[PDB]
Nucleic acid binder design. Structure first.
Ligand code: MG
Lengths: 90, 40, 92, 79, 8, 49, 96, 145, 96, 81, 104, 95
DNA sequence: CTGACAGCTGCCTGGAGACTAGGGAGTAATCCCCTTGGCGGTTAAAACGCGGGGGACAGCGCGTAGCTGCGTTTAAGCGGTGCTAGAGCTGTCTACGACCAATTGAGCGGCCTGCGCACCGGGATTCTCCAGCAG
DNA sequence: CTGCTGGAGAATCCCGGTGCGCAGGCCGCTCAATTGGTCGTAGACAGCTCTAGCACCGCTTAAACGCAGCTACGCGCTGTCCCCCGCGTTTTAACCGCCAAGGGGATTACTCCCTAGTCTCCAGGCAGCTGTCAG
């Protein structure tokens, strides 16, 4: 009951579901390995967050489809593994 | 035969026209049998 | 000076929906979409010209690129619109 | 260790946006790994673009180009 | 006569 | 068409359009050689071996 | 007399011609190619703008926002196919 | 294939001494009959069809046959046919073509049969066509004296 | 003698994965290609190389789709492949 | 030329599945595979026919099929280009 | 007269690459070292794929590289597999891979 | 009877450098030529886009190096960049 | 308060106007290479049973691990302030690439010929299977 | 009743031999790299300017984590039953070969002429600014 209401609430909304500061910290931590003392424009981090959330939502949709195909409501890591394997990003 | 010879010069190739003319020379029923007429 | 399709998008919107506005983010989306489809069609036209060993991009190349890229109904409507525009341009 | 910044409720929110009803407890580590891989690829391409321009600041256009070449174009930042 | 360091 | 015409004229005939079985080809041959009533034997030139 | 006005279009045939020339698509660009490209772009823009305006009307709004464009793109099958691998910032996803 | 039985019958009627091998049957039966055929004095005469020789040309081409007899050689009359090309280089000590009509449609068939029999005498078909086909055709058609 | 179910299937799996030959007869594929093409434009001639390329591409696509279908079938604890498996593979691939 | 989709034969689909690693095949797989192959061929052939029509030709060359596959995202080697 | 490939120490043609870059409509101007770099990169990629293909051919007791060997080389190497992910090799076949659950 | 430029001889030279004994078939040579052409098209297009982004009218060694870095995976890209920079240094030294 | 439309400013750039070089039409013309309605074989891939073994599907019984409710604990978010690394823009001027005559040799097909490879034929070895037996 | 090997049947594997057609080479020939020039100009590089990206806090407060309670379903265990597999027997269609007369219709080569490209000049479309106003 609560799950469906939450689904509808987040489905009608457009705001970013991931908190901005943790995602920025993660982006900077990842970028630290490729180059040292890197600066990021705010628009760049916003674009990265948009792309990451869209990718994660699409992957979660594919994994929910995989779980439904397995006669299950819960999503399991094997569903993520199969979704990525079929999509070809593996 | 005259209709096919007229259609020869204008899309059907010379081989197609040749075969159609051979069929015509064999029997005109090879294209369409004479209808069996009946009331509407 | 920065060039953008905002003015032309606004004119088209006013032509189709005279009383409907457009937000700045939506205008940016429209500019990005126009640039994307322009680049795709132009790249396909360039590839078609190179494949056929032609040094000039003509209306035929753009038409073939449009037919290759756009889906069915969109492709045919765009072809009709482009042919009409070219016919009007040549008759002046 | 900023990968823990992607909290479990955030993963649940992302799944709900995707129409997921129930989520297993081991999904969170897997999705954190997936996000880490994706971010690594995109950021690597963006840093390559930034270095090519002799710039020390990764602009939004670099990220847009990286996403476009990854096969997922993004609208709204290129103009 | 030619070897690649990628295969070490 | 020849079957129709011959039957309309009443001429007893046999037919071999190459689609008959080999043993049935031999049987038809022997029948034609033995039976005198069969006036004609319509055939396809390219067939019969 | 403007070339766009001569062609009866609203998009900048001149700007498209300059972009085709400065771009490395070919060493020669014909006269009718920019006109055709501008017409095609204008048609696509008009279609997507009409769909976005209809979606905005369905939402009791008067300005087109990115959500309206996202809904218009995803609802129309042909435009969804054209922009299948495209993500719209602050656009969301279709109701489900 | 139709004449295969008749030829086997004639061989048995006239010369019962000869060891006759018949290549009829499905692939399993053909392989079963082939089993142990490399031994000398295993078979004297082998009977097989043009379809079987064309399909099984890899096995037959390798062997060194003594005599190669082609009954109803008219099937070889077109050199552009796969049968002619597949059989052209067969390993046979001597060759013999049996036919009723060495010429049927054009002199190119005659060249084809001759080339199949004596390749070192009719090496070129185009030269033969230029020498004979063009003038003889002109004569028959009235284009040449 | 009768081999138990599954053994001959694995044996032909190994046989057909060892080889690289085309698995669809050339004449049926050529006919299908001509039938499909006659709808788009009449009086179109296909070169043999074009038909061979089409057959190779189609066989590769079908092989990859069958691999995905088998992966779907192993998921949900099954061995047989069912149309739902193909549908799931295609939907995840981004088609339809 | 009509009803040529049946040329895609049931043993052919079985062979393709076995090459794909499938062990057991349901009876309803064949129709789905026929539809999928029909769609894929339709798309590729439409693109190739457009390419040929652009060149003012009436013969579909292998280069046009290669270009169509490359545009679809399925670049094929060994047939030129 | 000394060729540019000889000067650069490569086997691929620097001059042909320069002509293709100029005629391919990629930019108004083409630098001097760009064809050299591109030829070097092409030669390296060819060397990698051919080394793996020859190793496959030797593993198959064959001296000439056939397309199956190239396909095996590309698919067995992870980096080349990623590089040629959306590429189909004619008469290439597939890797022998039977899933564990299907085994008896 | 017209010239058809191909990388057959160069691919053969590279093969002989790597494997002096192994050979290559016509279909395999066509596949290799297609692969070389495809990689050339990829790198050239990436370089052209890189030049356009930076408002540069020329394709230099830097553009192709960045294109190789963008396209090829990790170890492949690193080794390719090493080979390319060695080649360019040798070419500059030879003048 | 706050984004968006508009009146106005300054400016870059696209609209006229000329020659004109050549990229792209007309015009053979050669030749390959089919092209397809009707025929006739000929098998070997398809097609159709059919007994049944096993896998898909339907339950049942758990019993636990995800869901739900409550209270902390915290960390995101916002609001200035604030300090500088660095993006953006501009003038010089060389280094470098665009053309352009002469070369000239390296790269095209044409023609040949070993020989690598595909395949036949025994003999060897391997994989799977149930019957009957030992327990 | 149940786990075990043995003999056997099918299946590859593997070593000789051998025919074939294809790659690799070599040889004329030419056209496009190459070399030696000129000669614009792209951008490499200082040098200036001012933008925003980072580092900081103090307060709000809503979200996140942990704990307790709880029961809905994932999964193991049974019991089917149906349906697709292995293989034997029958169908038929690739396909191959005639049979024919001409018919495209890519190609190479010639000619030749509209239409871009380059150059020049000038006025209008437009980027952008803030003022104003509805939300
Ligand atoms: Mg006779």
């Amino acid at each position: 009951t609560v799950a469906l209401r939450e689904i509808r609430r987040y489905q009608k909304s457009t705001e970013l579901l991931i908190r901005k500061l943790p995602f920025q910290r993660l982006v900077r931590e990842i970028a630290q390995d490729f180059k040292t003392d890197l600066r990021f424009q705010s628009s760049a981090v916003m674009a990265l967050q948009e792309a990451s959330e869209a990718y994660l939502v699409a992957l979660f949709e594919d994994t929910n489809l995989c779980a439904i195909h397995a006669k299950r409501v819960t999503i399991m890591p094997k569903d993520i593994q199969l979704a990525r394997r079929i999509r070809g990003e593996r | 035969y005259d209709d096919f010879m007229a259609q020869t010069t204008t899309f059907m190739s010379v081989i197609n026209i040749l075969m159609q003319l051979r069929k015509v020379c064999n029997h005109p029923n090879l294209f369409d049998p004479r209808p069996v007429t009946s009331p509407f | 000076r920065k060039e953008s399709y905002a003015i032309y998008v606004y004119k088209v919107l006013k032509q189709v929906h005279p009383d409907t506005g457009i937000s700045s983010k939506a205008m940016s989306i429209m500019n990005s979409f126009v640039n994307d489809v322009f680049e795709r069609i132009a790249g396909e036209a360039s590839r078609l010209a190179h494949y056929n060993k032609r040094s000039t991009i003509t209306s035929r190349e753009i038409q073939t690129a449009v037919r290759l890229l756009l889906p069915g109904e969109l492709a045919k409507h765009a072809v009709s619109e482009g042919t009409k525009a070219v016919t009007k341009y040549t008759s002046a | 260790d900023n990968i823990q910044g992607i909290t479990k409720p955030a993963i649940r929110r992302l799944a709900r946006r995707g129409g997921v009803k129930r989520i297993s407890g081991l999904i969170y580590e897997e999705t954190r790994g997936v996000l880490k891989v994706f971010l690594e690829n995109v950021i690597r391409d963006a840093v390559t673009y930034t270095e090519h321009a002799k710039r020390k600041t990764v602009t939004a256009m670099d990220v847009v180009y990286a996403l476009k070449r990854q096969g997922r174009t993004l609208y709204g930042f290129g103009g | 006569s030619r070897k690649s360091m990628r295969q070490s | 068409v020849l079957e129709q015409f011959l039957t309309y004229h009443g001429h007893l005939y046999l037919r071999l359009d190459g689609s008959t079985r080999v043993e049935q080809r031999q049987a038809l041959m022997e029948r034609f050689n033995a039976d005198k009533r069969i006036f004609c034997f319509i055939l396809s030139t390219r067939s019969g071996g | 007399k403007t070339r766009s006005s001569r062609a009866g279009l609203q998009f900048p045939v001149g700007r498209v011609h300059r972009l085709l020339r400065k771009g490395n698509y070919a060493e020669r660009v014909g006269a009718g190619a920019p006109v055709y490209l501008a017409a095609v772009l204008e048609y696509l823009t008009a279609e997507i703008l009409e769909l976005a305006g209809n979606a905005a009307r369905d939402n009791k709004k008067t300005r087109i926002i990115p959500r309206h464009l996202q809904l218009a793109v995803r609802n129309d099958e042909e435009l969804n196919k054209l922009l299948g691998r495209v993500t719209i910032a602050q656009g969301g996803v279709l109701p489900n | 294939t139709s004449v295969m039985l008749n030829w086997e019958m004639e061989l048995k009627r006239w010369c019962p001494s000869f060891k006759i091998l018949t290549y009829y049957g499905a692939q399993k039966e053909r392989k079963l009959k082939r089993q142990g055929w490399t031994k000398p004095n295993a078979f004297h005469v082998c009977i097989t069809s043009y379809k079987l020789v064309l399909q099984d040309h890899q096995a037959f081409r390798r062997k060194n046959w003594r005599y190669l007899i082609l009954d109803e050689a008219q099937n070889i009359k077109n050199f552009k046919s796969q049968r002619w090309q597949s059989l052209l280089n067969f390993n046979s000590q001597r060759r013999l073509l049996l036919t009723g009509t060495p010429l049927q449609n054009s002199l190119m068939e005659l060249w084809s049969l001759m080339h199949f029999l004596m390749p070192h005498v009719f090496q070129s078909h185009r030269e033969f066509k230029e020498w004979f086909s063009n003038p003889l055709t002109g004569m028959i058609e009235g284009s040449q004296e």
